[PDB]
Structure 1
Amino acid sequence: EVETFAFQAEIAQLMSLIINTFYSNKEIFLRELISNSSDALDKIRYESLTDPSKLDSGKELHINLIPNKQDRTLTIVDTGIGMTKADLINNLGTIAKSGTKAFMEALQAGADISMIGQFGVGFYSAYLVAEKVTVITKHNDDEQYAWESSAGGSFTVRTDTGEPMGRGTKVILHLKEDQTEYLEERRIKEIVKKHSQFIGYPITLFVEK
């Protein structure tokens, strides 16, 4: 059962800008997704202090980076708080609308795309390198969902039948054909060292073959 939803105009506009603007410093997408993961990990950790049962779905708090050259995907996996269906369909949109408006304005106080994370919409920088983004997510007390969008003004949400995750979020970046450098081990290592050196959770870069 696949449901299809329209983005609000503001977010559709932001995604178009990110896809259509000439901007060479694309590597910042990874910093933004890892930062999101760290925030999600902070949240489940904090909640677990008052309710330890919230870690029954997995006690390990980490981030894995998984390149797959055959699929042409880079996946950012975390065991953070995860997202509910209401998050994916309603709440994200509400938050993202205001953040987009501010970011658009700031871009006309001369700001540059690399400051996107300060407006809470850093996720969408994924579209600097990805033609399609699939997000698999599992929050305690809700089902596992797959969100997906190739931009163009719509996204889908479905109940996910893949491998159960326990708790957390996987962001699967289906890379543009000219952005395959982000599947290379030394390139990913370079970016993590440069932008994400002090994240307070283990980041494991998986290797390939």
Structure 2
Amino acid sequence: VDVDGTVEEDLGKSREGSRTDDEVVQREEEAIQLDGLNASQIRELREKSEKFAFQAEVNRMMKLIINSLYKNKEIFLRELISNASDALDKIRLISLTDENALSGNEELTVKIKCDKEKNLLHVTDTGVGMTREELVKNLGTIAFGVGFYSAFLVADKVIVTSKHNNDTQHIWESDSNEFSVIADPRGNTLGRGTTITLVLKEEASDYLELDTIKNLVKKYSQFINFPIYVWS
């Protein structure tokens, strides 16, 4: 930028006389060295390490941009379990200030049951839970909230049974067109926490598979602090 003018190559410099060799490094950098490692070889090696890693960055960006995420929404389990761990984390924080926070369910775990026959997936958590008013406000009107709502990408209808410390257990059900909240017939079966029964779509039958759900848990939720149980 500072100046312009790029030199050309002197295709026939060699003939010049009484001039010093301006290529010692290049030639010597490839001479076979018995009982020693050739200079050029070591250079190539590190180059492979650094250069290869750099290519990986392109790989990552390529996927993110060139993908369709929601079309290939296998992450929906990540979103669902991630919320379950988050809710267990939230209730754990509340428990320290208030003993009653964990009264409904002291144990913090996630239980997963797969019902292929009924096209239903049941995810049960013992997290903070949700009140009837919160079910209408938070869930009845959406909004990130993607963690719970990713389920609809593979599910036509979502059924949520939520019990919070401040309120009795209530069930919020929506098909994405309308939502209804009613008092839970079973009562405080959870004590506290949320169990989501997912009405999966026809395309989501593979997710119902016991192996598939376990693979998704390893793929995305392996690092969850709380133990994860899969029905077997």
Letter in 2 for 1:155: F
- List alignment gaps of at least 5 residues for structure 2: 1-67
Match of 1:151 among 173, 176, 200: 176
Find the counterpart in structure 2 of residue 200 from structure 1: 225
Cα 1:22–1:48, aligned 2, differ >3 Å: closer, same or farther?
Answer: closer
Letter in 1 for 2:179: F
Find the counterpart in structure 2 of residue 81 from structure 1: 128
Distance 1:141 1:91 in 2: 16
- Corresponding position: 1:189 with 2:214: yes
- Tell me the number of residue pairs that the alignment of Structure 1 and Structure 2 aligns: 164
Shift of 1:197: 1.1
Give % identity.
54
Letter in 1 for 2:183: T
- Give the TM-score normalised by structure 2: 0.66
- Corresponding position: 1:162 with 2:182: no
Cα 1:22–1:35, aligned 2, differ >3 Å: closer, same or farther?
Answer: closer
Match of 2:197 among 167, 172, 195: 172
* Partner SS state of residue 150, structure 2: helix
Shift of 1:77: 0.7
Letter in 2 for 1:156: S
- Corresponding position: 1:134 with 2:154: no
Structure number with larger C-alpha Rg: 2
- Corresponding position: 1:31 with 2:56: no
Shift of 1:70: 2.5
Distance 2:146 2:208 in 1: 24
Distance 2:163 2:214 in 1: 27
Q: Relative contact order (C-alpha < 8 Å, sep 6+): which is higher?
A: 1
Find the counterpart in structure 1 of residue 63 from structure 2: none
Letter in 2 for 1:161: P
**Runs ≥4 in structure 1, deviation > 6 angstroms?**
none
Find the counterpart in structure 2 of residue 60 from structure 1: 107
Letter in 2 for 1:45: R
Distance 2:126 2:171 in 1: 16
Distance 2:133 2:111 in 1: 26
Shift of 1:93: 6.3
Letter in 2 for 1:127: F
Distance 1:80 1:200 in 2: 13
Residues 5-54 of structure 1: CA deviation (Å, up to 9, x unaligned): xxxxxxxxxxxxxxxx9943121111001111111101111111122232
Cα 1:92–1:130, aligned 2, differ >3 Å: closer, same or farther?
Answer: closer
RMSD of Structure 2 on Structure 1 (CA): 1.9
- Give the TM-score normalised by structure 1: 0.73
